[PDB]
């Protein structure tokens, strides 16, 4: 029973549901993410001041 309970576990980190995840919203040194350059994604991020 204990082995069966242990095997059912998500060892990898949970997949990003979207922009609403607090992990992406709150920056950290242990998880770095960014765009490429000043592209349309940069414009979209700039327009929304959040």
């Amino acid at each position: 029973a204990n082995l069966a309970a242990f095997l059912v576990l998500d060892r990898p980190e949970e997949r990003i549901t979207g922009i609403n995840d607090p992990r992406l919203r709150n920056p950290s040194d242990k998880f770095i993410y960014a765009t490429v350059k000043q592209s349309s994604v940069d414009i979209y991020f700039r327009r929304q001041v959040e």
Partner: peptide
């Protein structure tokens, strides 16, 4: 593209 970027207002 000579610059190699899409280009926006910078």
């Amino acid at each position: 593209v000579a610059d190699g970027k899409f280009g926006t207002q910078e």
